[PDB]
Design a protein around this ligand. Sequence first.
Ligand SMILES: Nc1nc2c(ncn2[C@@H]2O[C@H](COP(=O)(O)OP(=O)(O)OP(=O)(O)O)[C@@H](O)[C@H]2O)c(=O)[nH]1
Lengths: 81, 49, 327, 146, 48
Amino acid sequence: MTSVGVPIKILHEAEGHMVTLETVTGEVYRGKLSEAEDNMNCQLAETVVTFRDGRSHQLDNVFIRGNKIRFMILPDMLKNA
Amino acid sequence: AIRHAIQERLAVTLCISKIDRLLLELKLPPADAYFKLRLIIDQVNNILS
Amino acid sequence: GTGEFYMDCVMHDMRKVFSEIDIKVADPVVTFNETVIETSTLKCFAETPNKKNKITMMAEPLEKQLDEDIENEVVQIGWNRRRLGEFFQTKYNWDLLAARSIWAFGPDTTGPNILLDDTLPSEVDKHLLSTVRESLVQGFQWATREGPLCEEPIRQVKFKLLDAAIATEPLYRGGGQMIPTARRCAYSAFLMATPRLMEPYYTVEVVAPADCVAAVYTVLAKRRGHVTTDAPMPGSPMYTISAYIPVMDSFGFETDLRIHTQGQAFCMSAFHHWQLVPGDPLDKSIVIKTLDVQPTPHLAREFMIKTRRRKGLSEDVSVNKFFDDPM
Amino acid sequence: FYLFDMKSFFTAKALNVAIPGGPKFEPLVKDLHTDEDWNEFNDINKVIIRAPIRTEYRIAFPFMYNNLISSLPVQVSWYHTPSVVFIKTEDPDLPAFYYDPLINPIVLSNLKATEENLPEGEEEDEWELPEDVRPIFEDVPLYTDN
Amino acid sequence: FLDCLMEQTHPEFYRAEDADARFTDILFIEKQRGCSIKSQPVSIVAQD
RNA sequence: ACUCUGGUUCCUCUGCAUUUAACCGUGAAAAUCUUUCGCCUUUUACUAAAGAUUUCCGUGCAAAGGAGCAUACAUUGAGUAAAUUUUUGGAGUCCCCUCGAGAGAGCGGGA
Ligand SMILES: Nc1nc2c(ncn2[C@@H]2O[C@H](COP(=O)(O)OP(=O)(O)OP(=O)(O)O)[C@@H](O)[C@H]2O)c(=O)[nH]1
């Protein structure tokens, strides 16, 4: 690929693993990042959604638009990458 | 190798290798070098099918 | 070992890596297999040492592909009633009333020989026959591994069983009496069926163009090999030849070919067929002397006699004792 | 070179056998003529000589054929090199890349041609390559007189 | 071909200009014969 | 923004060229010790092979210093310079209910 910035490269290395991301509406999604994009659209699988009141539900697949993601907690091994 | 890999139920992929032999040794032009590569792929698919 | 280069490398590691001692190496040799080429012209009976039981078997030569299928495990004996019956009719358009009978392969569960029960059910009940069945199968398996001409494995023989004399004895008769008796039955069945040796064969792939084709045919003709492929290898100046050659003759072949070609050719060898050694192992008119060439009929007899001598057996076959006086 | 390089002559020396047209040496172990006793292993009633296992095979393989290979410094020749098929061209006016008639034609008559999943016409034919995208060496000639 | 995967991941991996390094042909019989004679495994991290 | 240096060539010094499958040498000598064949009214000088060691004709790279020929400041090791949906050109403010002195929060409601 073209030289996209290091945070986007680390996001694609995060595809193997579990990531936890919060959306601008406040819901926290934990799941296994199956595809990511350079606009940081995220596809999660085996997802658990946690609502802002602390309720939770399972979701088989979730697509989140990249500009609606606030942050992602990435796994630690990516610090080595 | 292909046949035994199928029987194992491996997943089979092809890599055509020492392509340089076409230009340097055989000196096939560009067009005939494509046909030689095409025939190799056909041979393997003939085994697979 | 596979062929030539495997045994060189194995023996290199033996000398250099692992053993580091003064080993003597015999000249290389193939294991043979023993096969029938006819249906047994008699049904051959064997009576147990106690005379209370009688077994009768005939040997037949196996359906031509089926030993590859068994040794590959395209068919497996655990599939016995439904799936094994279906396999034999669908592939072979076959015996299927008798294919349901089969219940055993020998000399092991992947061995290239089959035992059938062909007793018509009026003669003995299936429970009594089921009691002896496990005993007879061990007898048939023993006979196919060790037994006949030169004590090489039997291959490509189908045995049929058809006898009923079984008595009130079951503990005493079942182990001791029946199982040695089933082996003599299989031998006498096998020995009536006109027996032959099989040797194993290589397939060869060779690449060099104008002069080397003629050299390939020459070197094969010296070593009983025969050719059938003549390919003008597409987009290459080489021709590709393929040939069958018998492993017992192959040992020089790679070095002979590269010398006579001057390295222009190279050949690799792979194995897949068993084929029948020319001649008759039992022909007493052939006398073998090691100082001289022993070409077409003598080949089977030499291979048997020298194999017996190597094993250390008696020089000529038991067959008068295995048929015995009654048969 | 196959039975005639370096390693074959080294092995030939250690084995104490000649190669036709190669060098010969003093025996490396002078005892071996004294050992000869014929009967017990060697007996030849037992073994099936289909062809004479004579010199060249003992030099090519060593360890499959030779006794005593632990005092003897047998060495292993390079097995094979894939034959270079360069055909010299004698007409200097030919193109540098050309289909030499000694090269067999690229055809196998029975061979089923693989399915090519090319893109289907109607939308995909409109697709166009940007006007400055160009083969990497477009105007460099495929070959020169060098 | 595996020597190329070695050369990319390693940097220190010397390949001669004359002859193949054949890193996965570790045995000395394989060095001398130069055919590969036994399998050998590699494990490497590599990018798509 | 900082110290850092002219190219090229040549000489001489210093270091390393043991993980040998293999090779400082795509070439190829001689000697010593130990051991095994053949010449000999004696010893050397020898024949032709092995193992252990040296000598000799060469060798590679790096670094350092110097000396000569034609002459130029940049530049190495250390580091700069795009308002129309997914970021870098506002879907933002205000006005009620809740907890609380206080100021924030509730997929809160609304203009
Ligand atoms: N001309 C040409 N020769 C190549 C090329 N790649 C490898 N070879 C040659 O082919 C020979 C074998 O290469 P290897 O890597 O040992 O091939 P290999 O298949 O791994 O050997 P094995 O696995 O034991 O069969 C060597 O002489 C290589 O120089 C190539 O790209 N061009």
